[PDB]
Symmetry: D2
C-alpha cells in the first residue's frame, strides 16, 4: 500500500524542517537536488528567507542490480555554508554521491526509509522500505468512480 | 502535539471505511451525527451510492457541575439496517447515547482514540489519547508568516 | 469545458455564503438537500454555529425528456426560520420542488447556472450553462502520468 | 479582492501550461527564476520530462547567481508577471529564450511569450508557498 503525500502535508513537513534549520543566517544558500528536491528547496527558501537557490542535476537509471549515475549540471564548491535538500532517501545511493560532491554541506530530506536514514544529517518523516511514496507533483485531482453504484 | 487533518486525507480514510461497508445493498440508509459526522456521512453516501441520509443532532446542556445531553433532532427507528457515523470517538460520551437510540445500527467513525475504541463497530485511524484532531472544516487556507526575515 | 472544484475552494465559497447569512441568530436550523447539499450544509452549520441540521432526500431518475421525482425522506415543517441549501442550481427542477415543500425557507446554493439563477434566494459563484462542475466528493488525489514521455 | 491560489490550482494551471509547450523535445532545459518560478519550474520539469533544471536569482537589480547562454532552447519560468522590472531584466540575459509565467496582469501581459491565467492589476495573488492549513475562527458563536 502506497503512502499518499498531498501538497498540504509536504508543506507542513517542509516547515517542520525549516524551523529545525534555524537560524537562517548560518546558511549561505540552498542547493536543491533536481528534480525531487526542487519543491522542498523552494519551500525552505521561502521560510528561511533565502534568495540564492541553485541546483545539482543528477540522472539515475537502474540496469538490473547496478545504478548508472550521470550528473548533468553541478553547482560549484565544497558546499560551504549551503543546505543540500532532496525529497527523500531510500537506499542512500544519491546521498553518498552528493556527499562526494559537497562534503562540507548540510544534507536534508523530507522522508527517509530505514536504509538511507542514517546517511542524512536531518530529515522529518519515517517511511518503511516496503512502502512507496506518491509525491504531490506526480498526482492530480481527477474523477474517481464510486465504490458501489447504486 | 496537534494532529492536522486535511479534506484530502479525510476522503482517503472515508474511502477505506466505505470499502469495508461493502456491499452497499445491506444498508437502507445513513444516519450522520451532527455536526462532526455530516461530512464523513456525505462521503460514505457518495461512495456507497446511498441516497437516504438522515441526521442526529446532539448538544450539551450544563447543569451545575454535570453536562447533560440534549437531543435537538433525531431520526427514526432503532437504526436497523442503518450506518450511524461520527467524525471520531474520543471518550464515547456521545457514543453511549447513539447506541441507546440506535441499538441495531452499525456505528462507525473515521478516527478513534483508545478509550473510545470499544464503543465503535469499526474505525479507520488510531489517534493517541493526548492528541487533538483538527478537522478541515475548522480550518482554511490562510497566509502564514515566514520564519525568517 | 470542465470546472474543477477542490475542497479548499469549496470551503472558501461556503464561508463567503455564511458571512452573507450573518447574523446566525435569525436562523433556527439548516435543511440540507441530500446528497449535494450535505457538505455545503455542514460548512454553513460550522460557521454559523447551528446545531439543528436536517436533510431532504430526493431521487431524480431521468427518463428521456422527463424526470421522475422521489422524496425518500423529508424534514418536517414549512421551513420557517430555516436555511435550505443545495450545492448547485442547474435548471431549477429541484428548486421548484423544495420551494413547494418549504415555502417559508431561505433557499441558497454555492454555484448557479444562468437557468436556475433566478430561482435561488442567494448563491456564490456563477457557472456557465455548458460547463460541467466536478465536485470534490466525486474526486480524489491519484497518480497522473506526465504529459510527455522521457 | 485577494486572489487565493491553492497548490492544486497552481498544479492544474502548470499542466495547462505544460500542454502548450508540447512537444518537449524542442527544449534543452528549464531556467527557474527563483523563488517564484521554482515550483512552476519544478512542475514543468516533471510534466515535460526535462531533467536539466537551473536557476537565475535576481535581486538595484543585483544578480546573485545565473546560467550562461542566450536562452536558445531553454524555458524561463516565473510564477507571475505584474509590472516587468525583473521581466525586462530576464529578457536581456536570455534574449532568444522562451519566457513563460502562470499568472499575468494586464501591464505585464505583453512581456511574456506565454501564460495561463489573467489577473486584474489591482488584485494581490496569494501563492500557496506563502500559506498553510491553519485553524480559522467560526464566523459566529451560535
Ligand atoms: N516518488 C517516489 N520516488 C522514489 C521512491 N523511492 C525511490 N524513489 C526515487 C526518487 C528518489 N530516489 C533516490 O533518492 C534513490 P536513493 O539514493 O537510493 O535513495 C529514487 C518512492 O517511494 N516514491
Ligand atoms: N457533480 C455535479 N452534479 C450536477 C451537475 N449538474 C447537475 N447536477 C446534479 C446535482 C444537482 N442537480 C440539480 O440541482 C438539478 P436541477 O433541478 O435541474 O437544478 C443535479 C454538475 O455539473 N456536477
Amino acid at each position: 500500500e502506497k503512502y499518499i503525500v498531498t501538497w498540504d502535508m509536504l508543506q507542513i513537513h517542509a516547515r517542520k524542517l525549516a524551523s529545525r534549520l534555524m537560524p537562517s543566517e548560518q546558511w549561505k544558500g540552498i542547493i536543491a537536488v533536481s528534480r525531487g528536491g526542487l519543491v522542498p528547496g523552494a519551500l525552505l527558501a521561502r521560510e528561511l528567507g533565502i534568495r540564492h537557490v541553485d541546483t545539482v542535476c543528477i540522472s539515475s537509471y537502474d540496469h538490473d542490480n547496478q545504478r548508472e549515475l550521470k550528473v548533468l549540471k553541478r553547482a560549484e564548491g565544497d558546499g560551504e555554508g549551503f543546505i543540500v535538500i532532496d525529497d527523500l532517501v531510500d537506499t542512500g545511493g544519491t546521498a553518498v554521491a552528493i556527499r562526494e560532491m559537497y562534503p562540507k554541506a548540510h544534507f536534508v530530506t523530507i522522508f527517509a526509509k530505514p536504509a538511507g536514514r542514517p546517511l542524512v544529517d536531518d530529515y522529518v518523516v519515517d517511511i518503511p522500505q516496503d512502502t512507496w511514496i506518491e509525491q504531490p507533483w506526480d498526482m492530480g485531482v481527477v474523477f474517481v468512480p464510486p465504490i458501489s453504484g447504486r
